[PDB]
Design an enzyme around this catalytic site. Sequence first.
Site, PDB file in Angstrom:
ATOM      1  N   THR A   1       0.844  -1.226   0.000  1.00 36.20           N
ATOM      2  CA  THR A   1       0.000   0.000   0.000  1.00 36.20           C
ATOM      3  C   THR A   1       0.860   1.251   0.000  1.00 36.20           C
ATOM      4  OG1 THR A   1      -1.802  -1.074   1.275  1.00 36.20           O
ATOM      5  CG2 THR A   1      -1.757   1.381   1.232  1.00 36.20           C
ATOM      6  N   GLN A   2       0.934   1.923  -1.139  1.00 32.42           N
ATOM      7  CA  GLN A   2       1.715   3.138  -1.193  1.00 32.42           C
ATOM      8  C   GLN A   2       0.803   4.333  -1.495  1.00 32.42           C
ATOM      9  OE1 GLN A   2       4.084   1.103  -4.660  1.00 32.42           O
ATOM     10  NE2 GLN A   2       3.955   3.272  -5.218  1.00 32.42           N
TER      11      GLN A   2
END
Lengths: 244, 233
Positions: free
Chosen positions: B1-2
């Site tokens: 998750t960026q």
Amino acid sequence: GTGYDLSNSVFSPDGRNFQVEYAVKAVENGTTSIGIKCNDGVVFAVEKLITSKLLVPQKNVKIQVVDRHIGCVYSGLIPDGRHLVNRGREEAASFKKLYKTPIPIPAFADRLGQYVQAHTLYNSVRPFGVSTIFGGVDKNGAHLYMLEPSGSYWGYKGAATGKGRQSAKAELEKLVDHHPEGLSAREAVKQAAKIIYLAHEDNKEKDFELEISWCSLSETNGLHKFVKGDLLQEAIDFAQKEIN
Amino acid sequence: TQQPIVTGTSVISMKYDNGVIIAADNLGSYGSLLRFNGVERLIPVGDNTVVGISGDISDMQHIERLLKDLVTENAYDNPLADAEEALEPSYIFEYLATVMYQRRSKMNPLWNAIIVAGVQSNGDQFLRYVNLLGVTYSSPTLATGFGAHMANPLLRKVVDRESDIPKTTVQVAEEAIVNAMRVLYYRDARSSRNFSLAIIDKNTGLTFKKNLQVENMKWDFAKDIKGYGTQKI
């Protein structure tokens, strides 16, 4: 005592590694192949014996490229040859990925060198049944290299291995003497075709097929490429002519 | 998750009678700060496929390497690397598509929207989209982000349905695209005046135009506009 030749990592009493030595046998027994370092690149050629008319011509290609600028040719146990190139490819890829720059011929050499030498360290593995002539152009010129099952390798002006290794080494040395100022990529392709045709006498029994590939700064933009069509036939001729 | 950081905006493309066209400005934004201006977001793979990327630049750079590698890898033990066994747009897409869906499935996506445009070996035009979720689809015209809203309605007026493609010329198509690029310049606060445009024609091959600029902009009427309601001067 004896039996110092049944396991791979064992030192004979005189300090040798027979297994490695026995590997060299498998090599010398193989087809002949050379490398000629011209003044701005390197030319590779190999002997392809036609075991029968059944072999689709031009099909079972031997010379391999690593990345986009390196060329590999080997004599001996082909499968071992490929195995090595696969490792070289991963090796080169790993390198580029971290340093961005495509792997330098020298660095690549030692990359294959350390891998091969690695197979003379344990009795759980067999040494490579191939000698490999490889090279290409990099940041500072061209480089020709030959790697032995022992893991040993050095930079050459010319190199040969296999059945007709001597005829070749003989011819290559002649070139070196009659060209102190250097040979051109174009010329090295010709000379190579000849040198392969001559070295084919120690196997004059079966008919063969020539295969040349080069990597020239001025001829291929530092990229490794196979010599095909016209330039190829032209060399086949220059050779066929001087073989008589 | 960026979360994206440096980013690229719209990537617009449509297809005409002989090939496809694709374009994207040369900007690398960092929030409202239009930070980088020499960013090429159109990656050509071979000369029959151009890949347009929008989204996080760092990931775009990563996908570039993958593509160049895919080219090197294809050449290996392949005597027909520049012939019968050369890379097809469809292969490049499937690969990318694969990678994209795998990353999302691993909860570590490649924050991009991508459009693969090109010409198959049999002359066919290829145009398909894939984003950080792995979603894929095709349409006579495709655009990512802002282009999905402003560019599409324009291009769709040139090629509304399939039967429209053979009736569209490179001139028409290129024009539509050039105009859309302008409209996007007018209303996308994250766009640049400079862009690149690529044409993959089953006949002329790949023409890669760089350093184009939005010209013929209408601004004169701006003078006649004063105040915001009752102000007269």
